[PDB]
From a paper:
To understand the catalytic mechanism, two further complexes were also determined – a substrate complex with [name]-1P and a substrate complex with UTP. Ligand binding at the bottom of the active site induces a number of significant conformational changes compared to the “apo-like” structure. The binding of [name]-1P to AfUAP1 is stabilized by hydrogen bonds with Asn249, Gly316, Tyr330, Glu329, Asn355 and Lys437. Interestingly, a PO43− molecule which occupies the same position as the UTP γ-phosphate interacts with R141 and T140 and induce a shift of loops A, B, C, D and α* on the central domain, closing the active site (RMSD vs. “apo-like” structure = 2.1 Å on all Cα atoms). Similar interactions were seen in the CaUAP1–[name]-1P complex with equivalent residues (Tyr310, Asn227, Glu309, Gly294, Asn335, and Lys421) except for the absence of the PO43− molecule, which prevents the ordering of R116 (R141 in AfUAP1). We hypothesise that in the absence of this PO43− molecule, the binding of [name]-1P alone would only cause partial closure of the active site. Lys437 makes direct contacts with the phosphate group of [name]-1P and with the α and β-phosphate of [name]-[name]. Tyr330 establishes a hydrogen bond with the phosphate group of [name]-1P, and Lys148 is involved in UTP binding, contacting the phosphate groups of UTP and pyrophosphate through direct and indirect hydrogen bonds. In agreement with the structural data, the K148M and Y330F mutants affect the Km values of UTP (10-fold increase) and [name]-1P (6-fold increase), respectively. The K437A mutant shows an increase in the Km values of both substrates (32 and 10-fold increase in the Kms of [name]-1P and UTP respectively), which may be the result of disrupting the interaction of Lys437 with the phosphate groups of [name]-1P and [name]-[name].
Numbering used by the authors: 30 to 50, 60 to 84, 91 to 142, 145 to 383, 401 to 473, 476 to 507
Amino acid sequence: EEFQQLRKKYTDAGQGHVFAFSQLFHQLSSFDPVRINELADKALNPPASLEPLPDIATASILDSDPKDLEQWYEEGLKLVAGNKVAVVLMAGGQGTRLSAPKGCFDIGLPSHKSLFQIQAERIAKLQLLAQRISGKEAVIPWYVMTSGPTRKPTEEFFEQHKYFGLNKSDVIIFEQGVLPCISNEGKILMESKFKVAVAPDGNGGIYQALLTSGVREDMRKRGIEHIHTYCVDNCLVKVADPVFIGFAASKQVDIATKVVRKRNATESVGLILQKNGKPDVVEYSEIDKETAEAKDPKQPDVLKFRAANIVNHYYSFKFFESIELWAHKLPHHVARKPNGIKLEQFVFDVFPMTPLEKFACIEVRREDEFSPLKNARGTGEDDPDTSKRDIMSQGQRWIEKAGGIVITEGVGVEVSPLISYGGEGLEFLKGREIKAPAFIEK
């Protein structure tokens, strides 16, 4: 009846094969088969000039003036105190490459805290450091962007931990768009017959997702003016980092990015770059050996092209307000996964559309800021062990810097975010001994 109305519209569009054979009816009613055809069509039928970003657009935790760094931290913490700052978490992944949602993974710290909890606590701590200047509660909304599979386990998990101390009203879980799977000839793939194989539409899907879910409208009501985005797998992420916030808003950019230093020319890292006079992210493959090896004229101890992308972004709210102008302009790329294709928009494809003066980039310290969880244990790289080690190494550093004496007879100290957000506030440990492995907690 109504069912056959659907089977007609899909068959007319060359996708009647998915009705070949009751939940299907509903899954398929959420898809425009024609729009699938459009994206499959444009995606299946589509010597660049590379230069570093302008020095006017770049800063460095390592190299910039301690005077500017301190001031940016202060201004960024001002913005947090005025409830102007928001975080959008990219939390789509599952832990299958390592089960549960990725943010639930326990990399094996002494506390056994998940990634979600570690991040929540950095938010809690940061609002508390902001309160010391505002005099009142500070609120950083945490918009958690999940995939379809992860939405309910994420909700139940945050519910089971009582939202890690934050107000339920300040943790907003929501969903990014999805697309069916499609074969090599653009025909929708069938996971089983009772359900379409689907997938999330790339980290570029965030922009449209901010509208559909009502997240942008919620930010508007709150007076949000600055937004930090990152991926849940960065176990060291400085959530809502004031130095980043302060930097970007002092230059009043639409978009800013965080990088770490590429130190050896052969590292396979994406680079934030001027590609054809536009800001862009360039894969390592499109980088020539000469340009990869090029040393900086004004600094031969470092490489010319050294801004290694870590998917860690800043946006103005004004920029979000403009999404309706260009959101359609964003191509759905092809992700081959030898049977099929995944149409994925790319978060950075909007970069070249940004005027150069509206774009900025800050290099940060790897060991304090980027330890990605990507691989199973024993891999030796981007795994729970390197993640564990980076956090416990940072913890020992912070302590030792404030005068603590850490003793290792077998390494590192887990410092809870609630005690210290970024190494501050540890003078109480001056003089005392600590037997590593150890765990410092509120």
